[PDB]
Design a protein around this ligand. Structure first.
Ligand SMILES: Cc1cc2c(nc3c(=O)[nH]c(=O)nc-3n2C[C@H](O)[C@H](O)[C@H](O)COP(=O)(O)OP(=O)(O)OC[C@H]2O[C@@H](n3cnc4c(N)ncnc43)[C@H](O)[C@@H]2O)c(O)c1C
Ligand SMILES: NC(=O)c1ccc[n+]([C@@H]2O[C@H](COP(=O)([O-])OP(=O)(O)OC[C@H]3O[C@@H](n4cnc5c(N)ncnc54)[C@H](OP(=O)(O)O)[C@@H]3O)[C@@H](O)[C@H]2O)c1
Ligand SMILES: COc1ccc(N2CCN(Cc3cn4c(-c5ccc(Br)cc5)nnc4s3)CC2)cc1
Length: 363
């Protein structure tokens, strides 16, 4: 009578599934892929040979018969069933939606393929970077800011140009001191910055591939010759699993509206966690884990008739690695410097925590 189905095996998804498995609660983890992607380290995996294999963790090794690789094509609310591509249909007592977001490669990887192929896709990316003396990164958000730093740190000899449509880099919710230091760190590293300029000829450019000559154009008339184009232009909420069933309760972004208990609006046994939840905080893997703690607890609490926890977001903690040897950010809304970020994030990129959570050892 009690059985939880988790749609999405990302940071929030594996956190919910790791908890219920340790509690021996009957659950089912569903992901279209066979491996969890530690995408927080995906940019480093685009620049360091042999590193990508540490960013994919097989679901079945951890969850065994409690994991199901499948594409969720819909959710049957009346019969309380999750509908899979291929006909499989999973009954649930409670449902956690952890579908996350999609984005341009290499920052995100949301294709159904073999772990070997996924790893190879990043190794190919590394070879493209290594071949390119001139590299352009499009999008000066928190992602492309790290992408530019990673390349210039691993390959100081390369000419790296970051093109950003705004006057300042990284998220607007960050302290001005943090955003200014991100700019300064990139400048001290030798990165060329093109601020307040939007790349205007994107749809004609070859992506993630070395070329002898690529002509990059901006809306201000600037033209940048390059060997390689990398996109860090933003993400989109992945609503493919629930868009039809929860149409009326979606935010403008495709995320699901929720109360403080992270229950999806108009429901008591359906929860949304991570990027696909319409919380006002920045889309963070770290926050997806906190959402998962509240979700699994409130399922157990709703069953045990006990009180329900709530999501009260404190001051923003946000760390920007600036290559493996530098960094800047904030903790509870206060500036923190290189020594802090370098040991907390830049060095390992939280890779070891996912492997520890998944009860596996990286290859
Ligand atoms: C793009 C980017 C993001 C970063 C980065 N760095 C950090 C960081 O350092 N710290 C942090 O907290 N967040 C960071 N983030 C944000 C972080 O990546 C996201 O907030 C985090 O991935 C949110 O995780 P979720 O659990 O909410 O969702 P995921 O995208 O991780 O996974 C979703 C899963 O659902 C699955 N799924 C979706 N729809 C499905 C369907 N219909 N059927 C089956 N499976 C589906 C997908 O296969 C996927 O495995 C970064 O360097 C880059 C380049
Ligand atoms: N925890 C972390 O350290 C961390 C690290 C990375 C990402 N994240 C999170 O993950 C999410 C995704 O971040 P993201 O940086 O990938 O995307 P993002 O935050 O949306 O930033 C992408 C930026 O690229 C710009 N852009 C888009 N198209 C462009 C073009 N053709 N030319 C020039 N600039 C262009 C956008 O500006 P316009 O909007 O003006 O087009 C936007 O500011 C964010 O919410 C972020 O909070 C967190
Ligand atoms: C010496 O005094 C102190 C020392 C340390 C602190 N802490 C440090 C960590 N944060 C939490 C954060 C987690 N994350 C992630 C992330 C992404 C994926 C995975 Br899997 C795991 C984590 N990305 N960014 C952040 S912040 C809270 C404050 C405060 C005071």
């Amino acid at each position: 009578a009690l059985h939880v189905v988790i749609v999405g095996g990302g940071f929030g998804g594996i956190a919910a599934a790791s908890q219920l498995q340790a509690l021996n609660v009957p659950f089912m983890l569903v992901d279209m892929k066979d491996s969890f992607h530690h995408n927080v380290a995906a940019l480093r995996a685009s620049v360091e040979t042999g590193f990508a294999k540490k960013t994919f963790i097989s679901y079945s090794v951890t969850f065994k018969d409690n994991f199901r690789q499948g594409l969720v094509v819909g959710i049957d609310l009346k019969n309380q069933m999750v509908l899979l591509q291929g006909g499989e249909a999973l009954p649930f007592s409670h449902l956690i939606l952890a579908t996350g977001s999609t984005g341009p490669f290499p920052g995100k990887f949301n294709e159904v393929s073999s772990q070997q192929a996924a790893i190879q896709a990043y190794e190919d990316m590394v070879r493209q970077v290594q071949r390119s003396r001139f590299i352009v990164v499009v999008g000066g958000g928190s992602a492309g800011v790290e992408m530019a730093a990673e390349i210039k740190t691993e390959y100081p000899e390369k000419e790296v140009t970051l093109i950003h449509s705004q006057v300042a880099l990284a998220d607007k919710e960050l302290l001005p001191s943090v955003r200014q230091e991100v700019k300064e760190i990139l400048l001290r590293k030798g990165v060329q910055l093109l601020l307040s300029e939007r790349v205007s000829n994107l749809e004609e450019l070859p992506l993630n591939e070395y070329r002898e000559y690529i002509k990059v154009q901006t809306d201000k008339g600037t033209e940048v010759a390059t060997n390689l184009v990398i996109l860090c232009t933003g993400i989109k909420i992945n609503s493919s699993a629930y868009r039809k069933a929860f149409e009326s309760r979606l935010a403008s972004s495709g995320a699901l509206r929720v109360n403080e208990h992270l229950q999806v609006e108009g429901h008591s046994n359906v929860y949304a966690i991570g990027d696909c939840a319409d919380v006002r905080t920045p889309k963070m893997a770290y926050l997806a884990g906190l959402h998962a703690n509240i979700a699994v607890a409130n399922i157990v609490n709703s069953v045990k008739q006990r009180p329900l926890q709530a999501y009260k977001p404190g001051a923003l903690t946000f760390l920007l690695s600036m290559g493996r040897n530098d960094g800047v950010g904030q903790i509870s809304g206060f500036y923190v410097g290189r020594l802090m970020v370098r040991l907390t994030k830049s060095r390992d990129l939280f890779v070891s925590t996912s492997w520890k959570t998944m009860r596996q050892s990286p290859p």
